[PDB]
Design a protein around this ligand. Structure first.
Ligand SMILES: CO[C@@H]1[C@@H](OC(N)=O)[C@@H](O)[C@H](Oc2ccc3c(O)c(NC(=O)c4ccc(O)c(CC=C(C)C)c4)c(=O)oc3c2C)OC1(C)C
Ligand SMILES: CO[C@@H]1[C@@H](OC(N)=O)[C@@H](O)[C@H](Oc2ccc3c(O)c(NC(=O)c4ccc(O)c(CC=C(C)C)c4)c(=O)oc3c2C)OC1(C)C
Ligand SMILES: [Zn+2]
Ligand SMILES: [Zn+2]
Ligand SMILES: [Zn+2]
Ligand SMILES: [Zn+2]
Ligand SMILES: [Zn+2]
Ligand SMILES: [Zn+2]
Lengths: 179, 184
């Protein structure tokens, strides 16, 4: 399971250095950007939080919430982003889908109870995660490393707007190439 | 078995979709795994070949995927190719080949519709590193054509993030080639 990732993180992210740390944001960004071609997303927002966390938001389809375990718990324990869950102290996931907001938490990768919130016509996903400082040699995301990836992803997804906000210093950049 | 069947049943959960961007997840993964060995395994060169038949070959001079017996009673390379990021590539490929230089020897393994062959010990060598070849399954992907410029953009990023690493790209479909290098 996720125990395997914690035991041998190098098998999943190459190392536990700064390049290993950046695998986490690369995965969560990738998953959001995937919704431009797969889910009619128009905007992805990436925030580098001053406490070391990361938030990635999109207006794609929303991770499926239908069930007897919710699909989001399967995603967050089985697929690419489960490595992020394994190596984070906590994650928060917000989904807009099927007419409602939905909220889930992971505490050392253990799911909370999926909560149905307010009605909404919006669709998309917000993923927030806090990399475990007991795993990583470095918990500082590099603005220019992240910017280079988001520029590539905007260029490969004509019409997608990607916003990067560094909450550590207020630095922000928007990436957009028209179709 | 089970875990790879899951990828074939719901590929969008692993690679987003089954179009051009989904196809490129496979090369991004295998390239990433090789480039990881620059920071982790003293690699100096990665070579990416877009094969004329649609396959991909990625070579590195890193440590070599471990070949010794895993706790699960198979060679560690078989665990890697069935359990971790590259197992998605295995699941969605008709076949894979893996050449490893490690522990004083050359080693060769195949995967046929993700099923491991018998790991074979080859000649002695002092070299270390890995070659991974894969052939994306046209029954999965709506296109099997890799985009040279898309691949070149990723390799330039990876060379910039790994000062001193040489990355060579060869398109065997038309002879186009690029070499990426940023000095330390
Ligand atoms: C981290 O989750 C990622 C997503 O990330 C974001 N940010 O959306 C995204 O990269 C991708 O999102 C998908 C990937 C596949 C489908 C997908 O296949 C859908 N189609 C359905 O009819 C559907 C509805 C419910 C359900 O449980 C499943 C899962 C089964 C599949 C994929 C056949 C599929 C669908 O509505 O949304 C999908 C979505 C939102 O894959 C995830 C879920 C692992
Ligand atoms: C697809 O394989 C990738 C590798 O890709 C390439 N091209 O080398 C690379 O990205 C990374 O390679 C690692 C990842 C971890 C270790 C690693 O932890 C080593 N340390 C050991 O002493 C060791 C020795 C035996 C052994 O079974 C393991 C753990 C198993 C692993 C890493 C698969 C570790 C080691 O020598 O090499 C390692 C190597 C080469 O992770 C893989 C295996 C998923
Ligand atoms: Zn990696
Ligand atoms: Zn560095
Ligand atoms: Zn549609
Ligand atoms: Zn993806
Ligand atoms: Zn070393
Ligand atoms: Zn060495």
């Amino acid at each position: 399971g996720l125990e395997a990732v914690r035991k041998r993180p190098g098998m999943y992210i190459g190392s536990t250095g700064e390049r290993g740390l950046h695998h986490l944001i690369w995965e969560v960004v990738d998953n959001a950007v995937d919704e431009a071609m797969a889910g009619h997303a128009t905007k992805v927002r990436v925030r580098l939080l001053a406490d070391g966390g990361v938030e990635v938001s999109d207006d794609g389809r929303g991770i499926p919430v239908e069930m007897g375990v919710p699909t989001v718990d399967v995603v967050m324990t089985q697929v690419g982003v489960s490595v992020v869950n394994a190596l984070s102290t906590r994650m928060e996931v917000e989904i807009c889908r099927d007419g409602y907001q939905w909220f889930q938490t992971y505490d050392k990768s253990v799911p909370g109870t999926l909560k149905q919130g307010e009605k909404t016509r919006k669709t998309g996903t917000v993923v927030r995660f806090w990399p475990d400082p007991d795993v990583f040699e470095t918990t500082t995301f590099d603005f220019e490393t992240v910017a280079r990836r988001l520029q590539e992803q905007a260029f490969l997804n004509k019409g997608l707007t990607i916003e990067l906000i560094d909450e550590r210093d207020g630095k922000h950049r928007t990436f957009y190439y028209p179709g």
